[PDB]
Amino acid sequence: SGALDVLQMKEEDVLKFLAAGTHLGGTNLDFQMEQYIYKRKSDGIYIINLKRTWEKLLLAARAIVAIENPADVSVISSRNTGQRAVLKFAAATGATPIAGRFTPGTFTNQIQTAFREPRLLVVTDPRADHQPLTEASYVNLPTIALCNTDSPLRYVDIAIPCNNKGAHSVGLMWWMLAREVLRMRGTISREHPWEVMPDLYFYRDPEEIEKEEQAAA
Amino acid sequence: MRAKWRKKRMRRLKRKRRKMRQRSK
Amino acid sequence: GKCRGLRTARKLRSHRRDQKWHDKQYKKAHLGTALKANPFGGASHAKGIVLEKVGVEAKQPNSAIRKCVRV
Amino acid sequence: VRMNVLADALKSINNAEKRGKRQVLIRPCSKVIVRFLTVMMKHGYIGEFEIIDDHRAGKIVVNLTGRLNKCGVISPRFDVQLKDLEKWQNNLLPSRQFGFIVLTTSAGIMDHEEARRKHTGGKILGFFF
Amino acid sequence: MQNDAGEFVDLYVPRKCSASNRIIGAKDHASIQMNVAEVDKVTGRFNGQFKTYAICGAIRRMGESDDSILRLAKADGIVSKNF
Amino acid sequence: KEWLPVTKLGRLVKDMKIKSLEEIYLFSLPIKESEIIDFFLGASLKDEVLKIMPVQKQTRAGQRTRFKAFVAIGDYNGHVGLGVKCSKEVATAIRGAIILAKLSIVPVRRGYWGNKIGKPHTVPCKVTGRCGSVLVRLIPAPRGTGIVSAPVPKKLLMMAGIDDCYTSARGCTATLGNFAKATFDAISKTYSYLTPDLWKETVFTKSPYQEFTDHLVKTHT
Amino acid sequence: TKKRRNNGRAKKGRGHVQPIRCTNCARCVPKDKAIKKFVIRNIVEAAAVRDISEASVFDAYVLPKLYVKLHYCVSCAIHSKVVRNRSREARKDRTPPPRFR
Amino acid sequence: GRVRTKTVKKAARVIIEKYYTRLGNDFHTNKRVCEEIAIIPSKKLRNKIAGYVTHLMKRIQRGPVRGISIKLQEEERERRDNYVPEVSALDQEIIEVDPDTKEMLKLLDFGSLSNLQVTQPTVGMNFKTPRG
RNA sequence: CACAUGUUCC
RNA sequence: GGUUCGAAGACGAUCAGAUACCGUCGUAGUUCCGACCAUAAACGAUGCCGACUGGCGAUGCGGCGGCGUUAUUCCCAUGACCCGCCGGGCAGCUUCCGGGAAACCAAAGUCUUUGGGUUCCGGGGGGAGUAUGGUUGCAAAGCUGAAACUUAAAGGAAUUGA
């Protein structure tokens, strides 16, 4: 990831970041997110640096690969946008998916049937999933978070600066991570592109599911 | 007894001692 | 202490001298009025003359009659 | 106003050490502070410092390591004999294995071990461990 | 910790924080044990060893836990030095 | 009778795979099983009850009274623990405090006073701990001095392995719950204070859960 | 103990403010301490607004409103239920109640 | 009050998720279906559970239910989750790019490309909500 | 518009 | 000089009684000038000077820079807005900095790891801010200020019932 031309920025990933609006930040700015931002455009939107996003995206990809057991990587999404992206990421990689309503006590209460013991916590949104960060303190848990400019850094341990508000920019970043964790371990060759198309990971609104069906009919 | 009126009672009592001591001199 | 000057010994000693008079034990042991009001006058024991025997009623809940002597 | 200069420098870098800053800036530069910083550096308590000598009282940037617990100052500078120098370090230093009391002597400014070697007393400056 | 005759005497040596250089306590349940995978230069694949770090729980609650790993990551060459 | 593990940290304890409880403290992993302590130090460990505190609350039909227990625990070499449990009945609270006391045992640091001959006996430096208004300080002491302290923290220093130490207590020490916890914090900070001997770069060994990540999946969940 | 950080008033740097009387009673209340209500209301609300309209000589005449700046004391406003007591965490909220009707 | 208690409700939840093909719509049939497949100690609870089942029936053909596990409705949701359209939502030949973000790519390596169209920035900063 | 007051122990 | 209000007082209600709360009057006073008086819950219940220790959005003044909308109109520059930066000015929000018995505190932190400087002030509760002495004041009263004796609690924060 450090000045290695195999892992530097790809042109195919540039057009994907811009079309999904991942470089578009929030209106406000958290003082820890002053190092991931190029400059604030007119209309008061900060611009997230995509190359530095890609560099932080690679460092978090080193985390899951270093975890020898793929099962105990807890991936949690609470907002309605992110359950569809995190479920197939856990299916493709081998991680543990949690889709909505994070029960308080899954990492602290032994009697619970959902008592999990991960080595890694991957968070779709720090504000939407602050509760998983609370039990990430009581148990020694390195934490990955998909942070926005507005997202605080309470008990996150590595952050990938992205747009976690837009639906297209949410599932694309997981489609980033689905490729890369399988690219250091041997599943995917880097010469040919990975065959799964990124609309599979994107959130489908119930209106959009209803919108789609008559064009198929 | 409020603390305000016991101070007022003291001043009425202190003034009474002022007149009583003054007539003897 | 509040003041920490290199030549504030007379300020520190005067403060400790004055604030000692506000202590109940120091003022009792260093005033003539406390020794004047003491019938013993610093004596551990003393001899007196019995003139009558007085019965003293007791205090709150524990109630009895205590036998005393006017010495 | 600013009565003591070393007291403000030592507490400024103690506040940074509690927060764990990598380096800290102190606003005045004095000969005593420069001598004070050289005492701690030979023992490896801090990272390497540098001064910015402008045409005023200069500014000192001191790189910090994580080896500092507390660097205090004793005011006023009480004179210390050789007889009660053990008494000073008994109630000020944490232990006899480590902890350094630095105090100015006629031979210069040095910690309490080197003052024992040269058999010279003087006025106390501060404590650090 | 040493004795006079040259033998280690403590029953264990505690860890140290990678960023703040403080020793991590035994009841610091918010401690981090990072594991950073290396990449082979030519094939771009996982090697097999670790580049592990250790951060105390105070840094996480103060919000520099991502920055602390990031600063060592430039120094250990994981992050591109231009960034 | 037989122990079945619940937390996956305790699974390696039953597989004869965790060599000591030191590397448990090395990685600051939480202990939530009282019998993990019983596997390593189940023989030399002893228990001693500090106080039975009959607290109560005012209800409409009288006062609801329950008994609060204070048990300090730990073998006389390297480890000491404290546990507080407030149950309905005295023996249940005493039994329930022992379980919580084993979960809260901490390693001690023993230092020398001046000269460094023999075995470490006293506190290596001046550490202190406090809760509420009770503040307790620990002072290094020469050999053969004994524990100069109040009787209740004296039992804790017997059970921590420290034979010589000078103490000083500031605050309302009649409250034994705060008086015992304030001392127990002070011993617990011995491995929280940085020592000039400890200035070397700590070599990182493999994580205990990492080293047997294949052993913890081939036989159970 | 201290109930309110601002002591139930907006006085922060003044130290002294002019008092104002109340609407129900004549209680002397400081201006920043008084519960101030400004009510925008018509002279007639539901029934009399209708029949006067056809009885008005001038067709399509808008009825003028009435503007009264109310000044209540602590005892008067609570007894008249202008404001009510809240929990210790609910006290710190100072946003107005939602306005839809 | 004809409010169903937790014992009646929880007994009716397990029946639906296990006997979807056996259950009907009208009250009297699934009353007798649940008679054989459930050990209900009294006739009163047998009518109450089957009656609450019938009220849950009207929720089933009108859409999904929160607290239920139906093998047929999850199959509808499973293929909808695995839907793949014929092109991606990322493949547009038209990408509108802010000029301030055009300075971003030019200082990077990937500055000038084929299908990047720079727009015109809005003049006059007006983005904050009015105070109050 | 008024609702003033009711010794001590668990 | 006294409009209004209004200690005292008068009268009418209420009540067992009102010498109170309610209502009608109403002296002193409340209004202006010249002199005393120096006491307030005179509060941020938080002495004054100096340094350090997170951010966040506001607001007052002054200064600096900048697309742009809008007036003199004939635009530069000045006004009114918008976007930032600087110094302190009153504040607010926020969090495991840290502290405190807690309430809570950017100070009430940088304290048993105790020392930047300098004043005032407290030693369980009453007696008592009392007596006496001194001093000021036309007076009211202001400042300083006990002891004899009595007492095992008084008190502060917080929890649960009533």
Ligand SMILES: [Zn+2]
């Ligand atoms: Zn009023």
